[PDB]
Every structure is written in C-alpha cells, then in structure tokens.
Amino acid sequence: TATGGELVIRTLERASVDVAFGINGIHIDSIYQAALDRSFRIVDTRNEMNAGHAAEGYARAGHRLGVALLTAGGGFTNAVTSIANAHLDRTPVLYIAASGPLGVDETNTLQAGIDQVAIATPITKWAHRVTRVELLPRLIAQAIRIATHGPRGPVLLDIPWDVLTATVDDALADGVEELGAHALTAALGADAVERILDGLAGAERPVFIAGSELTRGDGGAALRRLAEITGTPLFSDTEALGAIRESPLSFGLLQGLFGLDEAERPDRVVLFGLRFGLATAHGSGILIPRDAAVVQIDSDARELGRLQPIELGAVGDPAAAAEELARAALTWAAGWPDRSRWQERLRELVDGRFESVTAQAVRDDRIHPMDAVTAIAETVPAGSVVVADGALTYLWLSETISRAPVADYLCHGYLSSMGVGVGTALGAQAADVTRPVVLVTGDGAVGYSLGEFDSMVRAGLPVVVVVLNNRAWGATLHAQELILGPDRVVNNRLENGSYSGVARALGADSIDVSDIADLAPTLREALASGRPTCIEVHVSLAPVPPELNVLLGGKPF
Amino acid sequence: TATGGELVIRTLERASVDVAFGINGIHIDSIYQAALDRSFRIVDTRNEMNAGHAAEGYARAGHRLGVALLTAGGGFTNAVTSIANAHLDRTPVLYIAASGPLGVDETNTLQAGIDQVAIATPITKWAHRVTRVELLPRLIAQAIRIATHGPRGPVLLDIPWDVLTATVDDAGVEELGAHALTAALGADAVERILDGLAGAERPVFIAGSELTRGDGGAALRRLAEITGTPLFSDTEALGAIRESPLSFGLLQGLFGLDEAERPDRVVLFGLRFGLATAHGSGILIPRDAAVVQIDSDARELGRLQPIELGAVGDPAAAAEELARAALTWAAGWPDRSRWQERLRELVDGRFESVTAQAVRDDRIHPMDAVTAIAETVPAGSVVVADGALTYLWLSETISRAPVADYLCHGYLSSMGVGVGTALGAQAADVTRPVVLVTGDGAVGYSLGEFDSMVRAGLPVVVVVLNNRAWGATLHAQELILGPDRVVNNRLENGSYSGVARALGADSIDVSDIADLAPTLREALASGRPTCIEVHVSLAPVPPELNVLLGGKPF
Amino acid sequence: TATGGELVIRTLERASVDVAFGINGIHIDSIYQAALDRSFRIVDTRNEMNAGHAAEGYARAGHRLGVALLTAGGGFTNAVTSIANAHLDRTPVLYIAASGPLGVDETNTLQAGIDQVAIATPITKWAHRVTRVELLPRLIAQAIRIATHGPRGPVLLDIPWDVLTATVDDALADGVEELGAHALTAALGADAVERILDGLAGAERPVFIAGSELTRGDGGAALRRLAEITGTPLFSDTEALGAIRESPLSFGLLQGLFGLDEAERPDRVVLFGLRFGLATAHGSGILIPRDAAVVQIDSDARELGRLQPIELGAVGDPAAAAEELARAALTWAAGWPDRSRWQERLRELVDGRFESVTAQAVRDDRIHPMDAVTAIAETVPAGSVVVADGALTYLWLSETISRAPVADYLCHGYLSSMGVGVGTALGAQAADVTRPVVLVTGDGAVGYSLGEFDSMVRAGLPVVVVVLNNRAWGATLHAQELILGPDRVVNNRLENGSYSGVARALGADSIDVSDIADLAPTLREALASGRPTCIEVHVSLAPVPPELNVLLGGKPF
Numbered sequence A, C: 001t002a003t004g005g006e007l008v009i010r011t012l013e014r015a016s017v018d019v020a021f022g023i024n025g026i027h028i029d030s031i032y033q034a035a036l037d038r039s040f041r042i043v044d045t046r047n048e049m050n051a052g053h054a055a056e057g058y059a060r061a062g063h064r065l066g067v068a069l070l071t072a073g074g075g076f077t078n079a080v081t082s083i084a085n086a087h088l089d090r091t092p093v094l095y096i097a098a099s100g101p102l103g104v105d106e107t108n109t110l111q112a113g114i115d116q117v118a119i120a121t122p123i124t125k126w127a128h129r130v131t132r133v134e135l136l137p138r139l140i141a142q143a144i145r146i147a148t149h150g151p152r153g154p155v156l157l158d159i160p161w162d163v164l165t166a167t168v169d170d171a172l173a174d175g176v177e178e179l180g181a182h183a184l185t186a187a188l189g190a191d192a193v194e195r196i197l198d199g200l201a202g203a204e205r206p207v208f209i210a211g212s213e214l215t216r217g218d219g220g221a222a223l224r225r226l227a228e229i230t231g232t233p234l235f236s237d238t239e240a241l242g243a244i245r246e247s248p249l250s251f252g253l254l255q256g257l258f259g260l261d262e263a264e265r266p267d268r269v270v271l272f273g274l275r276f277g278l279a280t281a282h283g284s285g286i287l288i289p290r291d292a293a294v295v296q297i298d299s300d301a302r303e304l305g306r307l308q309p310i311e312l313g314a315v316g317d318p319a320a321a322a323e324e325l326a327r328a329a330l331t332w333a334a335g336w337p338d339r340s341r342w343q344e345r346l347r348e349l350v351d352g353r354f355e356s357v358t359a360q361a362v363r364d365d366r367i368h369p370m371d372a373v374t375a376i377a378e379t380v381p382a383g384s385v386v387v388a389d390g391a392l393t394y395l396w397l398s399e400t401i402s403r404a405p406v407a408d409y410l411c412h413g414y415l416s417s418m419g420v421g422v423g424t425a426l427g428a429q430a431a432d433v434t435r436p437v438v439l440v441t442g443d444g445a446v447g448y449s450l451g452e453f454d455s456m457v458r459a460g461l462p463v464v465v466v467v468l469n470n471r472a473w474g475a476t477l478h479a480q481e482l483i484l485g486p487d488r489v490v491n492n493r494l495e496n497g498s499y500s501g502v503a504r505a506l507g508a509d510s511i512d513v514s515d516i517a518d519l520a521p522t523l524r525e526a527l528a529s530g531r532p533t534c535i536e537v538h539v540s541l542a543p544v545p546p547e548l549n550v551l552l553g554g555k556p557f
Numbered sequence B: 001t002a003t004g005g006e007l008v009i010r011t012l013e014r015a016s017v018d019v020a021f022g023i024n025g026i027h028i029d030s031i032y033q034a035a036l037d038r039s040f041r042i043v044d045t046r047n048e049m050n051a052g053h054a055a056e057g058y059a060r061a062g063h064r065l066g067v068a069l070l071t072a073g074g075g076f077t078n079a080v081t082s083i084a085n086a087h088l089d090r091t092p093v094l095y096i097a098a099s100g101p102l103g104v105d106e107t108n109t110l111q112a113g114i115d116q117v118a119i120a121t122p123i124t125k126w127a128h129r130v131t132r133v134e135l136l137p138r139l140i141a142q143a144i145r146i147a148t149h150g151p152r153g154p155v156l157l158d159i160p161w162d163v164l165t166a167t168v169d170d171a172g173v174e175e176l177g178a179h180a181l182t183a184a185l186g187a188d189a190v191e192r193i194l195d196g197l198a199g200a201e202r203p204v205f206i207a208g209s210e211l212t213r214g215d216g217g218a219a220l221r222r223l224a225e226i227t228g229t230p231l232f233s234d235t236e237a238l239g240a241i242r243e244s245p246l247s248f249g250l251l252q253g254l255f256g257l258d259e260a261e262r263p264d265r266v267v268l269f270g271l272r273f274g275l276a277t278a279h280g281s282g283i284l285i286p287r288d289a290a291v292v293q294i295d296s297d298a299r300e301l302g303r304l305q306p307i308e309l310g311a312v313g314d315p316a317a318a319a320e321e322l323a324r325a326a327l328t329w330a331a332g333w334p335d336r337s338r339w340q341e342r343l344r345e346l347v348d349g350r351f352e353s354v355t356a357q358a359v360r361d362d363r364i365h366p367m368d369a370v371t372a373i374a375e376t377v378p379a380g381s382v383v384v385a386d387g388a389l390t391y392l393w394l395s396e397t398i399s400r401a402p403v404a405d406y407l408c409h410g411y412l413s414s415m416g417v418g419v420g421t422a423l424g425a426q427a428a429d430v431t432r433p434v435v436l437v438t439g440d441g442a443v444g445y446s447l448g449e450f451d452s453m454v455r456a457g458l459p460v461v462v463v464v465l466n467n468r469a470w471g472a473t474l475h476a477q478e479l480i481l482g483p484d485r486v487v488n489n490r491l492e493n494g495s496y497s498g499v500a501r502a503l504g505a506d507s508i509d510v511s512d513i514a515d516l517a518p519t520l521r522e523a524l525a526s527g528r529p530t531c532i533e534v535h536v537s538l539a540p541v542p543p544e545l546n547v548l549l550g551g552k553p554f
C-alpha cells in the first residue's frame, strides 16, 4: 500500500530534491506524514509566499528543481507572487497544492471552491489537477519534465485532499516514470557553429552576453572556455553573473557596456539565453547597439529579435551551444585575433565607472550606499551566494557586485517584486547549509517577511540579512521627488521601527551599523557565527544610483 | 483637464469611501497624486496582502465598500489571497491594480507580462482591464454596482500605467449602487412564510452575512421580537442579531437538542449551507425541518438539504416585509416562551459546562482567556478573530460580548488575515475600539503591520494567544494520528510582544489569567497600537474542533 | 499613412503568405480593404469553421503558415473547433480575429462582450489582444514566430475594430520585424549523433517512425536519405506519410507493425517528432514494443517517455536531427549491416495484411469500403493531396493509403472532429491550384459543411469530394451494435438526402457510383475536369475496418 503523499515523496526522491518548503495543513498532511517516515526534509515557513520564494532560491542557488508544498485555499493563494516571480524569471519550481475533496466538491466546505489551476494558468508552463491517485507518479514526472526544460519555469499540480489520501498497490508505487534528467538537449549544428564562429572571427569589437538560461544548464564552464579561447569579453545579467565571474575575460553586468563612443561600440554581440527586456534596456540600444550584428540563442523563438534586429537566431539550448562553439573554436584553422586593445578599453570602461561613482559620492551623516555595497562586495567570501532585494539598495549593489567572488547573485527579475529576498535567501541557504548566504535588502522590502527570521532560527539556516535602511520606500520616493518635485512625495516614508530589534525578538543575531568602518568587520563576524543574523545598516536616502536613471529615462552617467 | 488618477479619486469620493489601502508604486502613482491634491486618505501597509485585507475589514466593519490600491506585478499578486477571501466571504471590495504600459506591451518590461485579469477572474464577480482613459468613470461605476449588490463580492479593475497618466476633458455622473431597490418578498410570499411560522411548534431564525450587508438586522430583530422567534446567526451576522433579547448567538449553539425538541421550522436570511451549518449533516439545521431559505443566488437554494420554500431575493428586504406584516398579523403570535426557555437553557448550559470541564495547567487556559476578553471588550467594539484553535475557543464566548461586529474566518479559513483585517477595520472608525484575537502562528504573516499601525495612528489591540505552535494542525496530527506523528507544527521560538515593541507599538506579556482583563483595559484606554502576548496552553481541545474533524462536538 | 489593416497585410506579405481565409464583417473589413488595394487574396467561405480548417489544410499541404481572418463575435467563435484541431495536431495557423471597439467597451454593442482571448487560451500557444495600432507589426511577428517553431501550433491575435481602423506613420510600416524564417533550429550535437548511430548499427531489427513535427520542418529528404544509407525500415503516422512515401525503405503507416511474433518484434525504434498517443496505440506496445530501445526526438520534453520508457530522449527539432544523423551515417566508418532479411519480413507483413484484408471482404449489394478505398488509392495521381474525413471511412482508407503516391495525406488528429475534411481540402487546394486534391469523406461528416461546395465553385478550387455514403453515422453505430447489441443502435442512422444533389445545386459536378467498376473511371474523369466535384459512393455499412477494434481497445485482428 502507498498513499498519494507517499507517491509524491517517492517521485521527489527520484528527482533528487532533498528539501521541500511549505506550511502544514490537514489537506496536504499526507505528504508530510510520508516525509516523516521516508525522512524527507520539509522546512516550514511563516508565510506560504516565502515557502515558494524559498523553493525559487533553493532552485536558483542549487542549480536544481525547487519544490513548494501548499495546502488548500489560502495556502495556495499566498504563493501566487512566487509563481509569478518564477514564471518571469524562467526558474524551475514545482508547486504542489492541495485542494478540496472531490467527493464533497461544491459543498461550501473549508478551504475549497477556488479554481487554483485557473489562477495559476497564466503564470505557469503547466497547471493541472490530478483527479486520480494512480495518475500521480506519471503526472508529476510530466510536470518535472516541463519545469526543468528550456525555457525553464514553474508548474502547478493541484491534488485534491481525497486523492492525496487515497491508496494504490505497491506494484504501481514502484514503476519508474521519465524525469528527462538525462535527455539530450538542443545543440548547435555543425553548419550553424561555423557561421557563428566565422562572424566572431571577423568582428572588430565582439562581446558575449549571458542570461539565466545559460546558468540553468551549467553552460558556464563551456561559455568561459569559449570566451577564453576566442578572447571575447564576457558580460551577463544578474542571474548569470556567477557563471561568467570566474573567467579573466569576464566584465560583469552588461549595464557596464554603457558609455562607449560612437566608433567604440561593439559590432557583434552573441547572446546566450538572454532576452531583450529590462536587463538590456529594452531595444533602446544603449547596451546592445541596434546597428550591431546580434546573434541570439534562446529556447523560445518568441524572444528572437523581439525588440531589436538580430543577424542570426538559433532556437536551441544556450548551454549546449557554448559547448559546441567552444569545441570548434579550439581547433579553428584560422586562429583567433588579439583582442587585447578591445579588452583593455572595456576594462577601463568598467573600472572607470566604479572609480568615478566612488569619487562622485556625496557623504552626509549617514552611511553612503556606495560605501555600504563596496564594503559588502569586498567582504563576502569566495563562492558565496548573495541575494539582493529592495530597489535603491539593489541598484547601488549593481555597481559593486561584479567585483565580489560570488558563486551566485540572485537579484530582482522582470516582476521586480519587493520582499522576495528573505524567502529567497532562506531557500538558497537550504541548498548548502555550509555555504555563506548574504541577503542585501532595503528596509521596506524586509518588512514583507519579518517572521521568516523565526523560520531560519528553527531550521538552522544562517543567512546574514543586511538591511540598508534609508527610512523609506526609497526608489518610489525618488521617482516622486525627481519627476514631480519634493512637494509631491507622499505615502513613501518609513521613519519608524528597528529591524535588528525585530530579528532579535525572533531569536536571531542582530547588530546595528551606523559607521561605514564597522560594516566590514561586523559582516565578517556575522558570517563566522553560523547563526541567522540581521545587520541593520543606517544609510543615506539622498544618493541616486546611476542605474536609477536608466529605468526612468536611461542616460545614467 | 483631469488625469486618470483624478478620475479614480472622483468616483471613489462619489461612492462615499474616505480611506484606501495600498503600497505606493510608480505605475499607480497617478492615483496617489490625485489623493494628495484631493486630501483623499491612503493608508500604506507593509504587505499588499494586508492592503487587501484592510479593505475587507474596512468594508466588513464599516458596512461600506472597501478599496485597495495595488501596483503592477507583485503589487497585484500579493493581494490574490485577499481577493479569494472576499470572494468566498461575499465581501464588497474594489481592487484597483495597475498594469504595464500599453504602448510598451510585450516588451519584457518592469512589473509587466502578467494577465492580472485572468488571474483574478476565478475569484471575482468581475475582472476587467480599462484600455482607454475616457472609460474610467463609467467602468468604475459598473465595478462598484457589481461589487455592492447581492451576493456581494470583489471586483478587479486593471488600469495600465499609461491609461492612469492619460488626461481627459473636464466634461457627467454615472450610476453607482446606492438608491437601487432590492428584491423584497412579494405580498403572497410574505403571508405564506408568516402563516407557516405561526403554526410552528419550535421555530428558529438564522441570519447570514448577506443580512448584514444592507443593514438587515434592525428589521430581523423586530420580526424575531414580534413573532417571539429565537434568533441565531453565523459570525458575520452576530452583530446584527446580538442586541435582541431573542438572540441566542452563533448557530453552533443549536446542537444537542433531543429528537422531539429538535427545531421544526427554520428561516435562513442570507446564510448558505456550508462550513457554518455543518453542511447538510443536520446537526444544526435538521433535515426533517421545514426550511425556508432567502438568498440572492439560486445556486444556494437547497444546495445540501431539502428546503420547503426558497426565495431568491435580498434577505434584508425580506426581513422588513415580514416584520411589517407580522406586526399587524390578525391571528397573533403564540407564546414560544417555553421554547425560548429551553433554548436559553441549552446555550447557557453549554457555556457553563465548557468552563467546568476546563483542565488547567500552569499556562493560561484558552477558555479562560477568551472568557476574559469577551467580558472585557467595550460595548459596540469590533472584535477580529484569527488563528484556528484561538477562534474556535472564542466561538464559545463571543456571543456574550457586547460586540458591534465580529470579523472571523470565512470558508477560505486563511490563517494570517487577522492583522490586515483589524487594521482596516480600525481605519473605518478611528475612535471606536478594535480588538484582534489571534494565534501565534497566524500573527507571523503580517508582523510588520505593527509598524503600519504606528505610522497611521490606528490603535488596534492585537491579543496574541501563544500556544507555541500552529495549533489546530498539530491537534489534527495528534488526535487523528497520534503524538508521535506531530511534525512541522511546533513554534517554540520568538517573542511577538518583543517584535511589536521594536516596531514602535505598546507591548505586554500576560502569564496569569488574573492580569489579562486589566491589561486589555489599559491597552484600550492607551489610544496606542498594543500587542498583548498571552501565553496559553496548547492541550485543550475546543468543542468545535471536533465538528471540523468529525461531527460530535460535545 | 498606413491603416492597421495595411500593417497586418504588410506583415503577412513579408511572411510569404499569399492566401488567407475568412468571412467579411465591418469590424475586420480594413484588412479586406488593404488586401484589395495590395492584391492580397482572401478566399471567403460559408462558415468561419471552414475558414479555419482551410487555413489548417493550406498550412499542412503547403508546408507553410496558414492565416484565417475572423470578424468579431460569432466570426471568432465559429472557428474554435479549427483552433482546437490545430492545437492537438501541431499545425501552424495564425488566427486574426477582430473585436468590439475599445472606445465603446462594455456598452452592450454588436458582436462585442466576448473574451475571445480567454476562450482561445486553453487551445493556443499564444492568445493576445492588440490594444494599440502601433504594436501591430511587432506583435504579429511575435505571433508568427511562436506559431512556426516546434512544437507548431495555433496563435490567436485579437485586434479591436477601432485599432484596425486607426492609422500610423509610413516610417512605422517601413521597419522590419523578425519573422523567424531564417532562425536555426535545435540540432543534434556531435556527441549526440555518435551515440544514436552507434546503437542503430548494433540493432538487430531497427525501425524509424516519423511524426508531424518532421513534416512541418523539411525533414523528409534527410530522413529518407538516412533510412536509405542505414537500410532502416521507415514508418510514420498519417501526417508524415507523405514525407516517407517516396523512399523505397518506406513501409507506410506505423499501424502496419502489428502482428510480428515475439522474437520478431523490433528491438530499436527512433521516433522523429511522433508522440505516444492515439497514433501509437498509446503505451500498449502492440506497435512500438515497450521492451524495445526507443530513441525519441520531440520539441517538448513533456512528450519524452510519456506513455512508455525510452532509452534516449532528445529535445530538439526532428528535421534537424535527421539531417545531422544522415550526414554522419553516410561516412559511418563501420558501414551498415545488411538489413535485407528484416526488410523482407516487414514487406511480407505489410503487403500480406493488404491482401488478407481484401481477401476477407464479404460483399453485399452496396459497394464494399475496402474496394472503394483500394480504387481511390490506385487511381489518385502522383504528388496528389488526399484529405480524410468520416470515421469508418478514414479507418478503411488507412489500409490502402500507404500504397497511394500522395505528396500529403491529411487525416484526423487526436481531436477526431468529424466535419473538418471539406474545409481542409479547400485550403489544401488553395495551396497549389494546379495540383489535384481529393477528399475521401463520410456521409455524416460532409453534412457539416455542404455550403463550401459554393465556396469551391466561386474560388475555383477544384476539390474532388468522394463521399463514402453508408447512410449512417458509421463508427458510432458500430460501437453501439458491437459492444451493446443490434437492438441498442440509436440516433445514428442517416437514411435521407443526396449529397451529389446538394453539390449540383451549389454548382459543382455531381455523380453517383453504385457499382464498384465505375468508381476509378469516375474519379479519373472528375480529376481531369478541373471543376469542384462530388462523387457519392453508395457503400456497405456492415464491414468493420480492422483499426476500429484498436480504437475500441482490442487488437486489429
């Protein structure tokens, strides 16, 4: 005999997921009971929203599938933001949601009567209800197959309460369904590889830019090797920063491409799983020039040439493309030109921007955000996972995070939902309890999930939560003040409360840092503690980060 | 010329809503700028989830329309729980959600690419996106008309960013819900219902949420007093019936009558067969009884039990028509005092028996805490209930409290809705007292709203009964599966009083039942947001927890 | 200045679509007005249902994108069956549907108040509403990109009337958006190709089976070559029959694999864009053995191992795989084993089945269906397009269609929606007016769209509609009689009406065939006429096609 919950855990075991995140409820308890016997670990949270965000962070940091367990009704609805965030971010998460019993369907009963699949459908690759317990292993396998393959994304499986508690015979409990984990991925053809490498060799000022989809299929090694073989500068968005960071050819976030002169602009750009959008300054061309020869490799043809003309488009796996290109570039008969002058100009461009912003900083009595984020970047150990939340907070960190020796940098996606950081950091920590996890967040955002400090305490997850407190919803205040004037700032000031105070009351290490000098030592000690820590950093609200201009009007200086 | 933000505030003003709840964002700012110029009040929160819940409580306590302002993307999605809660609870809330700019539609831009209307459609009476700025007054009025008329429910209007910032010429007035006539009982129907009532041996009235919407209870109390019929209700309807001497409190009190004493006629005023009625089991409303059901949705008539007569009309208007005719009823009304005395003996006997059977340990008994709270709340105050075991225990004492409105869990039963609900309920009337009775697990959802209350001057008294666990879920595991099977339900960490203090609120801990009532009294007199952490015992099983699990409450 | 209708016609021109199908209305009329000026051809039909099916058939026979134009309200809703059909069949059709004006939204006006995007969403790859006329070129290009790349499928674009009638600058018309026509497709990697060929050479009894996604790409030449190099028997489902037919290694429909002995069953199977489903007898193994080594190439990982365990899975374009595999197979160092004995046994099985089923025919007064479809198969010209409708009709045609020299055989997909044939052939005919198009349909199915005889006459589309008239809803009648008994036959008999009479009244050539000897001569003359023709063949109801037993559960024999 096997219950439906047993069937769920067994399939999750076969998929090699060690942790799931949820809040217990009677509808979903059969999964928890199975996890107790099979000694599968479920980390409970204080909001189901952060249970989903934890699965996201677990997936993003672990380079694995993430699983969230949601009970019926409000258990599901509280997770919708995480589903939406994973949807836009191309993140592989499986959401398991209990539902009302089918046998008493339409009885106005507890936590029932909500079409959870319909709510989830617009923001999932697949949302389906499992109506029979025997279907459970096969349908979860299909869900995982969909979620884990490009473009990655969330899947919702709704399992009614009486389907979860129903039983099947041990024979069906043991048959093996296809998880696609060893399925061969869309690679670049021989003819395509020669065309791409040919144009690259012919370029005067070529650049590679990587995106999330390159990371989700361990394309980092291949892309770095290809960049190093060809000597092409490597850029990326936040989701791929860890994939490119190790390469000497790495130049960090692609926002650094701004500022080149008219002749200096890149003539050829090869995109590895990056979409035209917020990260590229849309099709404006300030980062990726419209007159440049753009080579786009993405798993969804809807992205090819979306906002900008592209010279060549490939509908394939960006990770496999890098490997195929790296292999052929090694034995490339013509050899590769010396791009040292091009590389040096970009290094002067990127390093100049860091230097100029630091020089231009105007200091008041409170800590300058540029000084704070420089402190954090210079202190985080090699191989660290850094999570970024808050708006002005993450915009400032974007100037220094490229210098940090990070395994993964988890920042805001297209949804740009403030508050996702704490839950995300929690799940990233559950990926490796040994590895350091630092969350840099704003004072407004951290308020979304204050109770999650208790979850980290009870689960033993030593995230260091660095709160840059400007005493406001910062960027929203800036938008009002800069665009409409200082008379128009309204409903954005947060001049109350101690976040270190809240975290301490919830059992975590808590410290305040009003002095820039005390930041780096305090962070160093926080990492050594092996304890959940909140560092409240009192910073100035006034400084406008360079990237803040881009989003309102570009032209950042 | 007026911006779309101005048009929203203009219609909200004509709709007679003075407070809105949201978190500001760049997409929705046109509304905030209009509110600043118009001196319209927007209360900011720490989570858009509680911005939505504030609108529900503002609506539920205020007997008015509630309005939530949600910015694009995560702003909207964070409120989905509130929409779903209002959906099942039949609560009139207008959710206004910004969206991406239409001019840069499908550009992978900020907070965009989400079909907010499709996401909201299954849990709203109406979900629609406004594509042109000129349509705003007419479409908002349509939304309000839908939201405010029976059965009440949430409506979502999605307004793209470039629609909000667009302008129109100043040149009319659109029809909102108010002054519409509602479905009353016909003259023939009134006589048939009243005729059967006079003939009844043991008649009972039960009121539901839809009676409260529309000020039904004044009429319902009179009719119960005129006919001498015992008056019952669910939690949303408790305040409507509470004042009547014919009131017997929450309808769970009907359990326990013997087979002959069992009620013979039941008239439902806007209450649905469901969790509140123990579905069609008959333990509260007997299946053998002649049931007369008055609801606005024919899908509700006889859903789980046979009904003798069903009317699709407005329950508030039904009470008025019936009360008028009962006053001049030629035959007169029989003396039900023996039946009422039996019911009073039943209800009060239960309160006393539960108090007697209490097993006390070193920590505060949950029955003692809610008895203290009920006897301490001022008259006409709003009491909000969250947590599972917490609200289930409160169900035994809340009827005796002199409460204006009792805001408890609906069918969604989503733990965490309490704080936002209480915050918005307080914004309805800042002077009148609001007490939230919540569990330790539930209050963790919205801990940061203590900061919102401080900045907004909303003096909610948050009473946290702390059992150091997600209580009812632990009980379900322990009672059904055994004590070895309890897993993922224990919360033996943290000080919620400590958390509130760090956010600027009044904070106190209560370890002895003797100090509870005095402490609550100061908190109410303080005029400050207050958190009272009451350390209570986890073990005692509230009687209603068995009904949720399996019939038989004792 | 350009109207929105001009923009839509201009993009369709760039996508190289010469024909679109619709029914005129005031809402969508600007597209018709722009097409009149630009000499873009719109074929009107008698039902929007067949306007959609015409776009499907045009796309399937034409190996191109199909476009259907629907006016607001009922115009859109009448096409829903066609959208669902393309959805399950993986057919690339772009549906452009007008809607009510945004300026009079929610005014209870004509043909308005219907959420056409919401209705289409469950049955489309993308369903979207165009709110501003400026977005028109970019959104259509995105729509086309989604529709044309694997897995192909339908896309719905909703354009409000007042957006269509709105105007934009000429410069906006000049800019070119990406139609993905030269985007490169997911190919097999060098490592991947080596693994597959290695297993193929080692196989004792390998088979290739092709599916719809091989034909949407140009994989037939590469697949036939690969089959010829390696000597591997080639099979397919109906949508790929035309892709394999030319090869001497082709053995026709994959249903012909049934009946081999346990030792004889294939040990290795390579699937090229075919899904486990109705075409494969699900995961039953009667066609594709469950213990066989299966290599599956599909565009969606949700299909990999859906109903059967697979040895190897590739998420790529099946057409590109055939090309990569064919190139390496040619120069395969080991060479290829002599599969002569395996080929002879398969030919013995396939040809033996044809002779046996014909031999087993018991004839009554009316024409036997096996003789009728044998005549049709033996008479249709080379390079002909055959469309199949009706139930028992298409099941019988399955026994002979493999022998017909057809360029494309358009038969029922998973939807199995009776009535699609007439519209499909109409659009299939519009692809190439010179090429012959023969539709073999049942009496019930042809009743769905009798008025399209008027469309074929007026448009000059000379479809030959052969109606196999059993005077009943055949397969449903058989299901009642076979499972429940002859007394339980109810609501399935159609003993009335002359379909030849109807076609004649609508201006088509009409002939009745009561004697099998006249069938082939009549078809030859009808094909030579160059006029729309209806041939009503009075056929026997009694004979049960072998495949009907499989559709019901049991074996073919």
Ligand SMILES: Cc1ncc(C[n+]2csc(CCOP(=O)(O)OP(=O)(O)O)c2C)c(N)n1
Residues within 6 Å of the ligand: A389, A390, A391, A392, A393, A394, A416, A417, A418, A419, A441, A442, A443, A444, A445, A446, A468, A470, A472, A473, A474, A475, A476, B023, B024, B025, B026, B048, B071, B074, B075, B078
């Ligand atoms: C869920 C959600 N609500 C509202 C917004 C709008 N918004 C963008 S930035 C910002 C301010 C964030 O303040 P804080 O977390 O203190 O960070 P800071 O900008 O001050 O560094 C807000 C409210 C959003 N992005 N997401």
Ligand SMILES: Cc1ncc(C[n+]2csc(CCOP(=O)(O)OP(=O)(O)O)c2C)c(N)n1
Residues within 6 Å of the ligand: A023, A024, A025, A026, A048, A071, A073, A074, A075, A078, B386, B387, B388, B389, B390, B391, B413, B414, B415, B416, B438, B439, B440, B441, B442, B443, B467, B469, B470, B471, B472, B473
């Ligand atoms: C949103 C949501 N998540 C989870 C549940 C499942 N659930 C029912 S009761 C309960 C425990 C509530 O704990 P607390 O608020 O401390 O109240 P107590 O039962 O301890 O009195 C939980 C998690 C739910 N009903 N709603």
Ligand SMILES: Cc1ncc(C[n+]2csc(CCOP(=O)(O)OP(=O)(O)O)c2C)c(N)n1
Residues within 6 Å of the ligand: C389, C390, C391, C392, C393, C394, C416, C417, C418, C419, C441, C442, C443, C444, C445, C446, C468, C470, C472, C473, C474, C475, C476
């Ligand atoms: C749209 C649709 N409606 C109904 C059916 C059910 N159905 C399956 S076969 C069949 C009979 C078809 O009769 P006819 O077209 O005369 O072909 P025959 O089986 O007689 O050869 C019917 C009604 C269907 N498959 N599709």
Ligand SMILES: [Mg+2]
Residues within 6 Å of the ligand: A390, A442, A443, A444, A468, A469, A470, A471, A472, A473, A474
């Ligand atoms: Mg801040």
Ligand SMILES: [Mg+2]
Residues within 6 Å of the ligand: B387, B439, B440, B441, B442, B465, B466, B467, B468, B469, B470, B471
């Ligand atoms: Mg509790």
Ligand SMILES: [Mg+2]
Residues within 6 Å of the ligand: C390, C442, C443, C444, C468, C469, C470, C471, C472, C473, C474
């Ligand atoms: Mg027939």
